[PDB]
Design an enzyme around this catalytic site. Structure first.
Site, PDB file in Angstrom:
ATOM      1  CE  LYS A  66      -2.207  -1.380   3.785  1.00  0.00           C
ATOM      2  NZ  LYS A  66      -1.541  -2.709   3.798  1.00  0.00           N
ATOM      3  CB  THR A  67       3.437   2.421   2.371  1.00  0.00           C
ATOM      4  OG1 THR A  67       2.669   2.566   3.600  1.00  0.00           O
ATOM      5  CG2 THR A  67       4.528   3.521   2.424  1.00  0.00           C
ATOM      6  CD  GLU A 100      -0.679   2.787   3.743  1.00  0.00           C
ATOM      7  OE1 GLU A 100      -0.577   1.794   4.512  1.00  0.00           O
ATOM      8  OE2 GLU A 100       0.297   3.496   3.411  1.00  0.00           O
TER       9      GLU A 100
HETATM   10  N1  LIG Z   1       2.955  -6.234  -3.939  1.00  0.00           N
HETATM   11  C1  LIG Z   1       3.718  -6.681  -2.879  1.00  0.00           C
HETATM   12  N2  LIG Z   1       3.499  -7.989  -2.607  1.00  0.00           N
HETATM   13  C2  LIG Z   1       4.181  -8.519  -1.614  1.00  0.00           C
HETATM   14  N3  LIG Z   1       5.115  -7.989  -0.743  1.00  0.00           N
HETATM   15  C3  LIG Z   1       5.277  -6.665  -1.072  1.00  0.00           C
HETATM   16  C4  LIG Z   1       4.599  -6.015  -2.116  1.00  0.00           C
HETATM   17  N4  LIG Z   1       5.046  -4.657  -2.124  1.00  0.00           N
HETATM   18  C5  LIG Z   1       5.952  -4.526  -1.128  1.00  0.00           C
HETATM   19  N5  LIG Z   1       6.128  -5.722  -0.451  1.00  0.00           N
HETATM   20  C6  LIG Z   1       6.972  -6.041   0.654  1.00  0.00           C
HETATM   21  O1  LIG Z   1       6.157  -5.530   1.842  1.00  0.00           O
HETATM   22  C7  LIG Z   1       6.951  -4.526   2.437  1.00  0.00           C
HETATM   23  C8  LIG Z   1       6.129  -3.306   2.830  1.00  0.00           C
HETATM   24  O2  LIG Z   1       5.614  -2.651   1.610  1.00  0.00           O
HETATM   25  P1  LIG Z   1       4.578  -1.539   1.962  1.00  0.00           P
HETATM   26  O3  LIG Z   1       4.917  -0.625   2.969  1.00  0.00           O
HETATM   27  O4  LIG Z   1       4.494  -0.825   0.654  1.00  0.00           O
HETATM   28  O5  LIG Z   1       3.192  -2.238   2.070  1.00  0.00           O
HETATM   29  P2  LIG Z   1       2.040  -1.958   3.145  1.00  0.00           P
HETATM   30  O6  LIG Z   1       1.864  -0.559   3.237  1.00  0.00           O
HETATM   31  O7  LIG Z   1       0.843  -2.709   2.579  1.00  0.00           O
HETATM   32  C9  LIG Z   1       2.712  -2.607   4.726  1.00  0.00           C
HETATM   33  P3  LIG Z   1       1.536  -2.386   6.192  1.00  0.00           P
HETATM   34  O8  LIG Z   1       0.410  -3.406   5.844  1.00  0.00           O
HETATM   35  O9  LIG Z   1       2.361  -2.762   7.379  1.00  0.00           O
HETATM   36  O10 LIG Z   1       0.900  -1.178   6.164  1.00  0.00           O
HETATM   37  C10 LIG Z   1       8.159  -4.141   1.458  1.00  0.00           C
HETATM   38  O11 LIG Z   1       9.300  -3.610   2.199  1.00  0.00           O
HETATM   39  C11 LIG Z   1       8.368  -5.493   0.791  1.00  0.00           C
HETATM   40  O12 LIG Z   1       8.922  -6.302   1.939  1.00  0.00           O
HETATM   41 MG   LIG Z   2       1.423   0.780   5.009  1.00  0.00          MG
END
Ligand SMILES: Nc1ncnc2c1ncn2[C@@H]1O[C@H](COP(=O)(O)OP(=O)(O)CP(=O)(O)O)[C@@H](O)[C@H]1O
Ligand SMILES: [Mg+2]
Ligand SMILES: Nc1ncnc2c1ncn2[C@@H]1O[C@H](COP(=O)(O)OP(=O)(O)CP(=O)(O)O)[C@@H](O)[C@H]1O
Ligand SMILES: [Mg+2]
Lengths: 469, 468
Positions: free
Chosen positions: B129-130, B173
């Site tokens: 997401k981020t 997000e």
């Molecule tokens: N499409 C994807 N599928 C799987 N793993 C991914 C991904 N994009 C990023 N990642 C992995 O997940 C980590 C976090 O990415 P990100 O911060 O963008 O996602 P997010 O915001 O969904 C985490 P949170 O759920 O903790 O908010 C990255 O550092 C990489 O380890």
């Molecule tokens: Mg996030």
């Protein structure tokens, strides 16, 4: 576009098709979207004045339903009346074209606007018209969508260049829950039978609470202080509530009401004790309530007194709401003909009272057309009592509005029940070509004649006037 | 009035009689960003936090009235009070707010009000997401559209988690946690993937979220996730898909990673071919970047703005975040901080690292986040952590929770050791982390500091020490 500079266009929507465009609430929305630059098409079972005036405007209108009518549509809007077997509905569904209800399209028109929504059992079209006229006089160029013609504008709907939207909100079938307004008015909430538990009423109460909960945390609910059902709901709203009415506890309190002729005069005391002396150009205490809901919204939004007082002093009404058709000299006397939309016993009752208060000792004569068999059955005894309050009465047959007859809920039954009460002896007129002749014999000099009801009755009174003109 | 405020008010209205907005817990992430957008829009902002800090000093300098410790007097003149979901009923500010009948709303509802009158593009899903939100915001910025954005992480190029733009656009997000995303009303919704960690209830929440889109709205969903594709018939809105799958609307072909950059072609629904250079590694980023490309193309943005933003994309803070190279006694190493905390996230990071590092080693410092998560996905952690050449384990980062026997770092290390692929070192006293690393390092090692907790702070202090 200049409007697009304010209002974004709906993604990929090029043509909006209306199935049942002559149905209630349909045309007003079509008008706004036509003026915004969308192509509009629509179909209806019957030809008529709504349907033909949209065509002048630029929309393609079809009489009768056929699947080819939906050619090119990006979305299809259906009226409440449409049945699952509609060839256009069926086909739309197959082409995988979005099908939405009418209240949903209204919500999309409200989405990026500052919406002022007007709901309640009685007074919605009127209050909506009054708010729209205030905003217009304040130079705020509002868009509006109303359930009746706004006489000063010549239409039930109009596109303005501002962000304001004034719109009538219909509670029927929770329609209104997609609406997201900034300010919501509830004029009243009247049960069919106050001293009896009615599940459909309590459910309806719950829907109005959910509607008010669509206001943002900073939104405003404006509610009639004189309605005990509304006042009981206050603690469940959870947003700022402003009240209005004759109650000593009203935030905007009406004092010293009098009616002279068909105008009202009264004073409104505001929450900070400001006094506003109002002249209102339509009659009855029920219109002073409607106009005070409107003044309360306007004042709460910071509109100046001058534009408020000008709009109310010059208010011309919504079409068919105590709408004076003219004076006519007949062999048996000079008479005044007035159209009124009231269809529920309370509405008919308030109308008669306002007629009485402006008419000295001359007679009140009514031509009443019940609307729907179902409502006639549901409030039968109340209709008998209220219709017995006039001096002379002509009944027309029930305007079915699509419903199947119900034994004991027709004009012949209403007539017999009234006659038995013995306050007035009605005449049933089933052949309307005979209407003028029948009136001619019972009429007296100085009679005020109310053509009353929500159905074809105003087309009927229209013909009558012309033939007497 | 300042020109900037005037220009915003011509598009976005002020909220009725809202003069001062108070945040309880304003130093939290998720709080400060929304607080700074509202500050920049012209509202008076006040807030409280148990701890002082950069954020709070940051806000305080900009014009916000900040206080430490919760206290009833802090509520002075507040028109509305915004609270995180972590707050407690004993909170002084919360109890008096309710007593003074000042409206009290959650963070997601304030985010929803920022979205109400803007053109919202919402980014949801289990992972990415981020990152995807940062990529979409960089594309819109590069296109001169001046978006407002609210992200759950730092957008490196912009130096901030959140930013107020003068236009109508909002990139945000959207967090599935406790249905918070249900308050949002966007024009466009991305769903990157949906993986468990009950599940059918999570599925239904996502379907409900997507139903919040207007009839003309767009859902953008990853074609490579079988659960999302299974849900497509329930959506009821236009769906555009993206991914490597043969049937994807926006299809990725010819992907190769060179160093830490990706190279690939995207084929668009009308067959337009676009050749992308992506300045971050791994197929998972190529996926996130193609969600971003698809949204932009569906909105009419020119290829050049998309390509330029993706070619210079700097990452979100802590997402495969390069901290630099360091010469240690036994070798020159490259240090990289990564936020991945679920086994799938750690797995794609290791992969992206291998694809860029030739025949040299990957050394990982892993800090598990939460005892509950460790318990729940224990076997998957054991399998994924076994894929590195050298592994240093930190103790679990509790985040609130009581220790759970069998779900701590010692247990993980044992099970990993028993598999026999890597023999881990447990480092409980982090003051010794540097010395332990120096004893296992070899020339050319890539060091991945991995996890969602204090590990990032720990890694950056090691870096500072090694710098001097
Ligand atoms: N499409 C994807 N599928 C799987 N793993 C991914 C991904 N994009 C990023 N990642 C992995 O997940 C980590 C976090 O990415 P990100 O911060 O963008 O996602 P997010 O915001 O969904 C985490 P949170 O759920 O903790 O908010 C990255 O550092 C990489 O380890
Ligand atoms: Mg996030
Ligand atoms: N506040 C009020 N309370 C009771 N009756 C009222 C009223 N305002 C108007 N009426 C009566 O009701 C009739 C219809 O008024 P109006 O059109 O404004 O209400 P409305 O739009 O709620 C009707 P509908 O529910 O059929 O849409 C009027 O001609 C008058 O008879
Ligand atoms: Mg009406």
């Amino acid at each position: 576009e200049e409007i697009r500079k304010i209002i974004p266009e709906m993604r990929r929507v090029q043509q909006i098709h209306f199935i049942g465009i002559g149905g209630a609430g349909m045309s007003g929305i079509a008008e706004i979207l036509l003026n915004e630059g969308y192509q509009i098409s629509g179909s209806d079972i019957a030809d008529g004045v709504v349907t033909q005036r949209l065509a002048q405007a630029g929309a393609k209108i079809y009489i009768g339903h056929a699947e080819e009518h939906i050619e090119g549509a990006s979305v299809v809007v259906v009226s409440s009346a449409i049945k699952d077997d509609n060839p256009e509905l069926v086909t739309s569904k197959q082409k995988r074209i979005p099908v939405i209800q009418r209240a949903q399209m209204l919500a999309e028109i409200m989405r990026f606007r500052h919406g002022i929504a007007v709901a309640g059992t009685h007074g919605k079209t009127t209050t909506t018209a009054m708010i729209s006229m205030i905003y217009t006089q304040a130079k705020l160029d509002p868009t509006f969508v109303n359930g009746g013609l706004v006489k000063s504008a010549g239409k039930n709907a109009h596109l303005g260049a501002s962000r304001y939207l004034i719109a009538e909100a219909d509670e029927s079938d929770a329609s209104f829950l997609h609406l997201q307004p900034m300010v919501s008015v509830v004029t009243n909430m009247e049960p069919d039978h106050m001293d009896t538990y009615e599940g459909d009423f309590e459910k309806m109460k719950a829907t109005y609470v959910k509607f008010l909960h669509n206001l943002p945390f900073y939104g405003l609910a404006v509610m009639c202080a004189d309605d005990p059902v509304l006042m009981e709901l206050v603690p469940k709203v959870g947003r700022q509530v402003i009240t209005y009415g004759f109650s000593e506890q009203a935030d905007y309190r009406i004092e010293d009401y009098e009616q002279t002729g068909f105008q009202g005069h009264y004073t409104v005391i505001c929450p900070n004790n400001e006094r506003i002396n109002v002249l209102l150009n339509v009659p009855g205490k029920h219109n002073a309530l409607n106009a005070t809901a409107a003044l309360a919204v306007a004042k709460e939004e910071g509109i100046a007194n001058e534009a408020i007082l000008e709009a109310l002093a010059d208010f011309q009404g919504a079409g068919r709401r105590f709408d004076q058709l003219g004076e006519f000299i007949r062999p048996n006397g000079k008479v005044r003909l007035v159209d009124d939309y009231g269809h529920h016993p309370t509405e008919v009752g308030v109308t008669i009272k306002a007629a009485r208060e402006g008419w000295g000792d001359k007679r009140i004569v009514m031509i009443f057309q019940p609307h729907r068999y179902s409502r006639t059955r549901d409030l039968f005894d109340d209709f008998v009592q209220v219709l017995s309050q006039v001096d002379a009465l002509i009944m027309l047959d029930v305007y079915a509005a699509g419903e199947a007859p119900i034994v004991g809920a027709d004009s012949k039954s209403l007539c017999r029940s009234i006659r038995n009460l013995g306050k007035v002896d009605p005449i049933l007129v089933s052949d309307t070509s005979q209407l003028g002749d029948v009136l001619d014999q019972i009429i007296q000099d100085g009679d005020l004649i109310l053509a009353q009801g929500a159905g074809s009755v105003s087309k009927i009174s229209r013909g009558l006037a012309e033939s007497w003109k």
